[PDB]
Amino acid sequence: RCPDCGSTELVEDSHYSQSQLVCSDCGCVVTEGVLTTTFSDEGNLREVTYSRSTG
Amino acid sequence: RFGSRCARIFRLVLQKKHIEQKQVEDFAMIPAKEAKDMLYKMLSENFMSLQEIPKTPDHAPSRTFYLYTVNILSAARMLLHRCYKSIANLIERRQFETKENKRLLEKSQRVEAIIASMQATGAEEAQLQEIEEMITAPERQQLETLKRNVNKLDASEIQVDETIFLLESYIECTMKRQ
Amino acid sequence: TEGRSRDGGLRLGEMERDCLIGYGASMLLLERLMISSDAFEVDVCGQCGLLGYSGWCHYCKSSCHVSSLRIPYACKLLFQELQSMNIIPRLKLSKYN
Amino acid sequence: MEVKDANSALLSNYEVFQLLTDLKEQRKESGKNKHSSGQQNLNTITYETLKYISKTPCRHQSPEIVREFLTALKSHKLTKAEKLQLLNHRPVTAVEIQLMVEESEERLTEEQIEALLHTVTSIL
Amino acid sequence: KRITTPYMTKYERARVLGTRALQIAMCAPVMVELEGETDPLLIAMKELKARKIPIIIRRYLPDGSYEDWGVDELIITD
Amino acid sequence: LKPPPLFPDTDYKPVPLKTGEGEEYMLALKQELRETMKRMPYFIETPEERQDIERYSKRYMKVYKEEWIPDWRRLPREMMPR
Amino acid sequence: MFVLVEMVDTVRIPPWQFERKLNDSIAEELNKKLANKVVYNVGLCICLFDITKLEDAYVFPGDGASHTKVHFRCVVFHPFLDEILIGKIKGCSPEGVHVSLGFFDDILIPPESLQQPAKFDEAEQVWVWEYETEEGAHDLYMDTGEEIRFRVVDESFVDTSPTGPSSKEAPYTLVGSISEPGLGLLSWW
Amino acid sequence: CRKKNICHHCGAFNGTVKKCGLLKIIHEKYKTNKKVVDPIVSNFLQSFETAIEHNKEVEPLLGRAQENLNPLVVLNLFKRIPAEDVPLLLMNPEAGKPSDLILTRLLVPPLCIRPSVVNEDDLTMKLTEIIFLNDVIKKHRISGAKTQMIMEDWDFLQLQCALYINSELSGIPLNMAPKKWTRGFVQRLKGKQGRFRGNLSGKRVDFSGRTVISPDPNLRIDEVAVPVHVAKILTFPEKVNKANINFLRKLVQNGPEVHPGANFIQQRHTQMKRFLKYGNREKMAQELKYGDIVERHLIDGDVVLFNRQPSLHKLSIMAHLARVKPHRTFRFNECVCTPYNADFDGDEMNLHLPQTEEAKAEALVLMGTKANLVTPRNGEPLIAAIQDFLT
Amino acid sequence: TQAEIKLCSLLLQEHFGEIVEKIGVHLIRTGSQPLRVIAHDTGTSLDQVKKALCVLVQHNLVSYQVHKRGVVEYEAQCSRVLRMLRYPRYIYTTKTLYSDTGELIVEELLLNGKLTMSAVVKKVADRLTETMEDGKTMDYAEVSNTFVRLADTHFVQRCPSVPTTENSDPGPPPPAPTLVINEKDMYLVPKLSLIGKGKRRRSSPIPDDGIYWQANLDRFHQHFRDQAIVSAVANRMDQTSSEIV
Amino acid sequence: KEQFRETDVAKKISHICFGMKSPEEMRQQAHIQVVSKNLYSQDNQHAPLLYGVLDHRMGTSEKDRPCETCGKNLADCLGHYGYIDLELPCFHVGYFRA
Amino acid sequence: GVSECIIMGIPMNIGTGLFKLLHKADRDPNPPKRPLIFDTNEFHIPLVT
């Protein structure tokens, strides 16, 4: 719910490169910016089966 | 700290300057799965030193013998360090008890001084019972509890000093001072 | 981020870093490399000289000697790993007069 | 923030009343800006103190009569704290004078107690 | 007396213009009449041309002693 | 999963303490000493400081003591208490 | 009671205040910053007394607000022990009588300080009074009352600093005495 | 101090201590010499009689027996060191003491420096295997097993701990040598991609752009023509004040689509952002108060740093006054070609926009084009006419 | 030696207090140093440092030495900081081997650090007034007899004497007196005949000036070693063997 | 009325002191000890163990989970340290030459 | 050093970072003191001799 207006018209939206969540009812940002992995660690990725992870 | 059997295994080693587990077990029938584990324990206590002669100059674990060796001087030293830490943490507790109880101590000392004061002056006797109605009266047993605790701490400190004499005397005599 | 499939933003490589030193500017290279790259804020306890959290020094069990300070994130990460190797930088701070 | 001296000097209620009156002259002379809680805090504390001292005997005094009172009291070998308490409180009977001076009966005589009572009632 | 050079070094000009532009960005009073320009840096440049900026440089010599010059008495150049 | 109690159980327990008239006398002597070294100038407590207000009572309960001075021939001529 | 204490601090002045002469701006800022609050060591600050010394006004990089340091003195509420004082009542309690000084209210008059003959009431919280010949256990102290005379005998500061990671009693306390003759309600004397 | 072979304090003769093997140290106290046999070794060697009797390989190598050192022995030796010797050992006593130099307890770094997927990071695997070994070795020594392999487990433990710091060690025997590369602490701190060379000195920045370059002589020698599309993206947060109030009102009304417009607002007190796409009204323009900051588009006369990627000398980066023009590539006057070394055969160039008023002033004064006509190598002019103007 | 350092600290706190503890621990952690650097490092008032150091040297906890360039170096012996724990032992053994007069002699000698013959015998006689009443009087004759017996039995040893100024280094005195110990007069008690009846707390010039004395800890330790050996043999073989030992 | 605390803590760095950490102090700093070898619970929730590695008392790296030590997300949590006791003492490579 | 200031995110100590600026404010240093009535020195004399 929008802290400024209490509505629930929030729609996640992106500007040219900014991922954000905007209260479309009144135009008030409430959650913006994110953190993500990179291609440099993509080739370094490994896997452990969950069963082996659980012992 | 370890029972008669531990004192048995060591004094075996004191007489038998160099020895290994199998000889120790044979020589004391310390049962299998008992001697080895205990031998590892008081190894961990630095009460025993491992010589570890080689089978090859690499001194590899698969190419060595685990000969046991004593060191009395180093012993006497870090027992003495044990005692030093001993006297300290006692004084810590004696002081901790003193500082935690200081509030009740002073509350009882002031009224005791009031009772003791103006006694030779010939004041009336209507103060002995009238002062005792305070809450410290059902706390005198706790004060005596503290007192015997300090007493019991102090006696051990006195005794510990009696060991210290033997330790300090021997580490001094074995020291040539050159 | 780096790529063009992902979002980008270019690099101020070390040659530019010298260029900016060369002119004799000082706020410009501060701005380019700390305000607009990884600006971040932390807190430290002046008594023990080591970072804590939320104005509460978990080491000292107190909130009196704590203070807040601005620092590039990559530098904060450097302090953590070095502490992780037991190499503790006990930093020392004072008034900014 | 750093405290340099916690016991530098002591003050009379007349001085603080004079100070508060000066501030009041610097008060309500312009529209309150309502910029921050500081306005309310200062107004409340100052007005509360003012109203408290509005019901005190120290009122209507002046620096020179206080100076003359203190100069006269100098000869009585009282402690400064006692002197200030006299000026602040203006005792009117000897019963509180007994409580007021340390060793009141031993240090000072009945006639000296009467003289101090006369001094406080007349000068103040 | 004062020993340093009497001209204004480019670095001093840069930091003075910067800090005055920042001060005028927040609603500080402007010391020269403006004709309608709405960019802080140009207002600050005009003020300096009029030599009215209220900023005093403090030149620290290496040992620790210092010398003060008002921004109106340095010889400003190109 | 769960690290133990901070205080693990131990089979061997401290050997019982001694008692006797001699030990009690030594304890009494220890109490006497800890009560004694507080009562001479060698027990240098912090000098009195930070009076609150000019109270009249100070004329009476002021602590008076002699300026302790050892045999000064036995010490360097650099720390005169005056 | 009133004490004047020396004080030093550093202050920031936002740029729009430059029009005013600097001393008055720093004075009003310092007042709002200090006034109507208590110090854990010296008591309750009332208002600044005077500004003694001023350093040079710096303009730190990254900001346009001039910084400066002040030496100044302030007046603080800090009564001393065994001080005589007159104050209104504010409420009775089993642990004593609460007394109000108008601008301060954390004063308690415990029953130990109260006169011996009266030790409890007729189940009414309004404290009653008892004497030998007159005042036949019929006089009682009103929760407001007059500015009764009393002498302080105890005082304490209690710190209320935050504890643990982020996300009511007054910190300054006093005790009074009313046993001695002449103390209490002036109607008695 | 190495010259002294006996302890003057207690007369004790001590041998050289030498690394007897990889991560193994030995004390040469009990060493025979070509000179007269020392009494210490004479008494030491004779003590192996029982071992010689039991096993026949003792006698041929009875002289290889020396005083070996291990973490327990060492630590319990340094815990007794007198304090006054510490300063001579170049130890800051406030920094620490010799006993903490030998380790018995290890930190574990916080999760914030290790992602959920490196599946888990090598550190997590390293820690898990270390603890696993710790549990098995404790319960298995509690099982009272053989000597040789208990200490071999000890050595393996030590080896893992060493590798947990440094992944570059190459002295491991063949039969347990690692078969793949892994990143130790030094690996990620050092190297071209390490912290120092990769992230601290030079780092990525935002409010930046990149594109092809083409000429445009109809501009002064101190300008550049940024395209509209990039002008709509890069912004500069202005503060509302008594001089520029009307201007920012016109920008707010134009919205985020017409060019001279804005993209966000922040309120003086409420730190929440307001997004002009969903403004729903122009009343946001009416409610401007002194203190709010408007993130306007880049407009004419802003100051933007221009830079050519292979920088060699400090004249490869300079500050130009921008103008917005409608095509899709950065354009600037060709007399400025010589410093940058550009060639208009398909190159590309970076653009940066500083985000402060101090940095704006600084870029204009020190870095401007008009103040950089002469190179600092010898004072000659660089920005001069080029081919086809000379003709 | 951190455990020992802590033991020193807490013993100084118990016996002397705070400033004395501070100066003591600093000195044992720093070794021989001149006064000025000690006062600098501690940062406290030089009067407190001076007072501490003189009280410690009075009880021989610290020593001072003339050093190169004429500076005076001040050093503390850590071992001596571990001797007050055995004061009950010394008092008990002297009470066992000597009457309560000897016990009081050792008590005064220990708690005063050093004393002269006249001072110690007078103080013991004065303090014994709490022990005898009903008109009983105390004369220095028996006190002197007990002390000379103690000194002869090596339990009490003489302190080092100051050098003679008119015989050595005439003119301006050196920074420190540089005391000299004499061995031939080690147990040579001074001679006196003064007697004074103790004042029983009614609340209504030194012939042996400079001849200071102090308890012989080595003799006490030797006696303790003998007792331990005798006890060892008693448990070992027999009481008769123990008596032979 | 309330006791006054300072409202600003602005300060500047002056020096960096390097050194090592004593084990009792290292334990005092650490929040908890990790004791379980395994990583995730046997159940299909993939939850981390109570006192195993990856316990969120250490921090967070999952956008939808807050930290246990402090109720803060990835962008807000600073990170928290823990410790492991080793039964048998060892050597440390960097200091081995020392 | 310049590099250290960079990695620590503080201004370097050369170029525009070599001098300090002051505000040319209209201020009166060490203004006349507030005068006092009660506690003037002449009226205090220690009671003890």
Ligand SMILES: [Mg+2]
């Ligand atoms: Mg090209």
Ligand SMILES: [Zn+2]
């Ligand atoms: Zn809304």
Ligand SMILES: [Zn+2]
């Ligand atoms: Zn801390």
Ligand SMILES: [Zn+2]
């Ligand atoms: Zn030695």
Ligand SMILES: [Zn+2]
């Ligand atoms: Zn957290």
